[PDB]
Amino acid sequence: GSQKLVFFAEDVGSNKGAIIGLMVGGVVIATVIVITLVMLKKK
Secondary structure: OOOOHHHHHHHOOOOHHHHHHHHHHHHHHHHHHHHHHHHHHOO
16 A cells, blocks of 8 residues: 555645644643642642
8 A cells, every 4th residue: 555655644634633632632731730730739
């Protein structure tokens, strides 16, 4: 299966990476904010 990288590359799939960044972003961001808020208070 040659010419599979270039094609998919130039085409850039279809907003695929967006999904990953969306989920990974919400989790990573949220997680950080949680640790900060929790570690900040510490009761």
